[PDB]
Design an enzyme around this catalytic site. Structure first.
Site, PDB file in Angstrom:
ATOM      1  N   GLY A 133       0.848  -1.187   0.000  1.00 25.76           N
ATOM      2  CA  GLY A 133       0.000   0.000   0.000  1.00 25.76           C
ATOM      3  C   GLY A 133       0.876   1.226   0.000  1.00 25.76           C
ATOM      4  N   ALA A 134       0.270   2.417   0.158  1.00 25.23           N
ATOM      5  CA  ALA A 134       1.030   3.660   0.213  1.00 25.23           C
ATOM      6  C   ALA A 134       1.928   3.776   1.455  1.00 25.23           C
ATOM      7  CB  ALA A 134       0.106   4.854   0.107  1.00 25.23           C
ATOM      8  N   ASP A 190      -7.361  -0.963  12.646  1.00 18.13           N
ATOM      9  CA  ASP A 190      -7.631  -1.807  11.487  1.00 18.13           C
ATOM     10  C   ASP A 190      -7.964  -3.236  11.881  1.00 18.13           C
ATOM     11  OD1 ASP A 190      -8.153  -2.124   8.772  1.00 18.13           O
ATOM     12  OD2 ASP A 190      -6.047  -2.481   8.238  1.00 18.13           O
TER      13      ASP A 190
END
Ligand SMILES: CCN1c2ccc(F)cc2N=C(N[C@H]2CCN(C(=O)NC(C)(C)C)C2)c2cc(Cl)ccc21
Length: 280
Positions: free
Chosen positions: A31-32, A137
């Site tokens: 991901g980023a 998360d």
């Protein structure tokens, strides 16, 4: 000072070349925020997980020290860290039995098996929250399982932080969606959503696009079950305590570890046939 910080970081990270100390790298996420690999520790013969993060420093030092000094059986623990040029690599434990996502999408768990998993996850949350770390998360994808039914919480989306909209839409608490009110109770909400995944195979609204799901959570608030009558009164009470709209009324991990629902937990070995069936 700036250079005295980079030298303190260089003193805290491990000595050695992780390109040599680890082998058989397999990208499992990206991901980023960074890249996640599984790898083989050459010296120990144990499978590990490695997070690689670029430039995106005094906070890094305390964060590394906190995970190096604080261990818990219900998290993938910090094993080592390295500075490879501009990149920071963090090595942690790994369980290769599968994820809770595999189990919930392929098999059917009974209340005793859900209670065992909830208890292990709550123990991980209690540990993190006591160190002022909010996960943000919590979801089945971040619960790794060993063949023996052992449970470890991971953070492969890079969301955990010491106390920008962070998380995975379907699992987000309404106060995160509407005002980014991060706090330990968002992890409890997310666990309640993961408990719904264990009953129904999915979080609420999975059929909708993730952005619409945000609007469904922000408006509906406490999600409804498809068939609540099929659940015990004790399980229903546990879910209500996890998915309470009022942040204060919502149970903490410490309080929820005392819930009567967890007292019916079957041994973790009861998860082994589900893990095996989910793997193939
Ligand atoms: C890798 C172990 N780890 C962990 C495991 C499993 C998890 F689900 C979350 C988690 N995150 C932690 N700390 C946060 C805060 C800072 N940070 C983080 O990577 N910092 C940098 C980038 C390395 C500087 C994530 C954490 C906290 C404690 Cl007290 C113990 C172990 C931890």
């Amino acid at each position: 000072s700036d250079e005295e910080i980079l030298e303190k970081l260089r003193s805290i990270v491990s000595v050695g070349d992780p390109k040599k100390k680890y082998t058989r790298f397999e990208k499992i996420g990206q991901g980023a925020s960074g890249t996640v690999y599984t790898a083989m520790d050459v010296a120990t013969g144990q499978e590990v997980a490695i997070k690689q993060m670029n430039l995106q420093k005094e906070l890094i030092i305390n964060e590394i020290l906190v995970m190096r000094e604080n261990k818990n059986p219900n998290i993938v623990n910090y094993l080592d860290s390295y500075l490879v040029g501009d990149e920071l690599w963090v090595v942690m434990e790994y369980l290769a039995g599968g994820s809770l996502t595999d189990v919930v999408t392929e098999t059917c768990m009974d209340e005793g098996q859900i209670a065992a998993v909830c208890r292990e996850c709550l123990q991980a949350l209690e540990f993190l929250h006591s160190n002022q770390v909010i996960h943000r998360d919590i979801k089945s994808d971040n619960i790794l399982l060993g063949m023996d039914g052992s449970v470890k919480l991971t953070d492969f989306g890079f969301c955990a932080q010491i106390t920008t909209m962070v998380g995975t839409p379907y699992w987000m608490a309404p106060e995160v969606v509407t005002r980014k009110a991060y706090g330990p109770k968002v992890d409890i909400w997310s666990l309640g959503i993961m408990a719904i995944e264990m009953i129904e195979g999915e979080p609420p609204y999975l059929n909708e696009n993730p952005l619409r799901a945000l609007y469904l959570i922000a408006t509906n608030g406490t999600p409804e079950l498809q068939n609540p009558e099929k659940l015990s009164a004790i399980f229903r009470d546990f879910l209500n305590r996890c998915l309470e709209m009022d942040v204060e009324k919502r149970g903490s991990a410490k309080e929820l570890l005392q819930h009567q629902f967890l007292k019916i937990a079957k041994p973790l070995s009861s998860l082994t046939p589900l893990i095996a069936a989910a793997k193939e």
